[PDB]
Each structure stands twice: as structure tokens, then as C-alpha cells.
């Protein structure tokens with residue numbers, strides 16, 4: 001359960017509003033959200049599988 | 052829609068120009084080419100690549 005051992009960590013850090021790669025294009029943020037990694041969410045919540 | 056009627060409200064005109072033309076929530080598509088940067092919105096140009 002360690003945050004550093006979560007296999008979603010590199011994709012979740014990539015899919016962040018703080019990432020220029022995502023920020024610089026309007027569509028990018030939505031492309032992440034549709035792949036179940038929401039950029040506006042905090043890290044641990046961004047990787048959680050709800051319910 | 053049958054008729055378009057003018058209301059001459061400059062501030063509302065500006066807010067609609069912002070919504071439709073300058074800073075749309077989702078811009079019209081523009082595929083990158085050798086001669087272009089890949090931005091699809093004016094809003095994105097000045098927010099991330101101002102000079």
C-alpha cells in the first residue's frame with residue numbers, strides 16, 4: 001500500500017495540472033480524466049480505486 | 052431561431068467573445084504542422100508562452 005510502490009504513481013504524476021505537458025493544451029486534462037486519472041485530484045486520492 | 056436582434060451590450064459582447072472565440076472551454080481542432088506550434092486556443096498562447 002506504500003504510495004511509492006503504487007503502479008499508478010508514474011501515470012498519476014504525469015496526469016497532473018502541475019505538468020506543463022498537460023497544462024499547455026486544453027484537451028490534455030480531459031484526456032487524463034477519461035483514462036480515470038483526474039489531474040485536479042490530490043495524489044493518493046488520484047490513485048485510489050473507489051468503492 | 053427566426054430572428055437575431057441587436058442588444059448593443061459591449062460587456063456581454065466581450066464575455067461571449069471570450070466564451071466562443073478567445074478562451075473557449077473546448078476549442079475547435081487544429082492539427083499541428085511543421086509551420087505551427089500546436090496550440091488550439093489564443094488563451095493557451097498567452098497563459099503559457101507569453102513574450
Ligand SMILES: [Cl-]
Pocket residue numbers: 024025026027078089090091092095
Ligand atoms: Cl490549446
